Amino acid sequence: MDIDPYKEFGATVELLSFLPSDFFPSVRDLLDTAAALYRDALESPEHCSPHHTALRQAILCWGDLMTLATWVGTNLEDPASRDLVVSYVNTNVGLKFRQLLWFHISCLTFGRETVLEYLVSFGVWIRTPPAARPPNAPILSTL
Amino acid sequence: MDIDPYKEFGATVELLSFLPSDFFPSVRDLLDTAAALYRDALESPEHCSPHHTALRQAILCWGDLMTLATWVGTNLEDPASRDLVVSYVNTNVGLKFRQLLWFHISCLTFGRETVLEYLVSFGVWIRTPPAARPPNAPILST
Numbered sequence: 001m002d003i004d005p006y007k008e009f010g011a012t013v014e015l016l017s018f019l020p021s022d023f024f025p026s027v028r029d030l031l032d033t034a035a036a037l038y039r040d041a042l043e044s045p046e047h048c049s050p051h052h053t054a055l056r057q058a059i060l061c062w063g064d065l066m067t068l069a070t071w072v073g074t075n076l077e078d079p080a081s082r083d084l085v086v087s088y089v090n091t092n093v094g095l096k097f098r099q100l101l102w103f104h105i106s107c108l109t110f111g112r113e114t115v116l117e118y119l120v121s122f123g124v125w126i127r128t129p130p131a132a133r134p135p136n137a138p139i140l141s142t143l
Numbered sequence: 144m145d146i147d148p149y150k151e152f153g154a155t156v157e158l159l160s161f162l163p164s165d166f167f168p169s170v171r172d173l174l175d176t177a178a179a180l181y182r183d184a185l186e187s188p189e190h191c192s193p194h195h196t197a198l199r200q201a202i203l204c205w206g207d208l209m210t211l212a213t214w215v216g217t218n219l220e221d222p223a224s225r226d227l228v229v230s231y232v233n234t235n236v237g238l239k240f241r242q243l244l245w246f247h248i249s250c251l252t253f254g255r256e257t258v259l260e261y262l263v264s265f266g267v268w269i270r271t272p273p274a275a276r277p278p279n280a281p282i283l284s285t
Contacts, residue, residue, distance in 0.1 A: 001174075001177070001186060001202065003185055003186055003199050003203060005199065005200065007186075008187075008190050008196060010188070034144075035144050039144050042144060042146055043145060043146060043150075045150050050193070050196050053151065053197055053200075054200055056146050056148060056151070057197060058200060058204075059144070060146055060148055061204035061207065064204065064208060065211065067236075068208060068212065068228075068231075068235075071235075072215050076219065081219055084219070085215065085219070092210075092211075093207050093211060096207070
């Protein structure tokens with residue numbers, strides 16, 4: 001099975017990938033925001049939306065990945081090995097969850113169509129050579 | 144926060160962890176079942192349902208844990224211990240994923256409300272002294 005967590009939401013991992021990694025806030029800040037804005041909806045007995053369903057699982061999944069990453073960390077004696085793992089995470093699952101959390105949280109905040117529009121827009125912008133390609137990259141906004 | 148992944152589905156962690164562990168098939172069996180019965184729905188662009196969405200996340204989460212655990216194994220252990228971290232994962236959180244995968248795959252196959260009454264009835268069964276519980280433990284079948 002090849003499942004792309006974005007696809008039922010109108011995007012793909014490639015679409016998210018156009019964005020530079022430093023575009024995304026830390027996982028810690030994203031989780032703080034999810035709490036501050038959607039905690040009750042997230043904890044309630046209603047589906048609310050497919051983003052909430054998706055988000056609920058991502059939040060818990062990240063708790064299992066940190067437990068595993070902390071465990072590996074304590075089981076490595078060599079500080080260079082630890083550093084290797086942390087870099088690997090940061091650049092792989094860690095960025096993956098930054099992207100995924102940012103996406104669902106932004107869809108909830110701005111609306112799914114607005115985020116998808118922005119991602120397409122940014123993807124064509126970033127990929128237009130410097131010469132052309134206006135000075136102002138696209139904006140993400142409630143309007 | 145405190146999120147119970149079953150609550151939007153009318154269940155709780157407890158309703159599940161209440162059944163015996165031996166009850167839940169292994170992760171590998173559930174994943175193969177999900178592919179065999181639902182691969183197309185799962186890889187498709189429609190939500191299909193809240194169970195499909197939840198099932199996709201669950202499957203991708205286990206895959207994230209496995210990718211992380213395998214990479215550590217292969218690249219930071221001697222070859223003979225390549226599976227060390229995978230094993231730690233299976234032992235530490237294997238059961239909790241087996242319940243989650245079994246619950247959505249089952250609600251997809253039998254319908255949620257049918258799964259719920261099976262869970263409720265197993266708990267009622269088991270909480271009855273083995274004398275009015277006709278060994279007919281209830282089963283999820285047909």
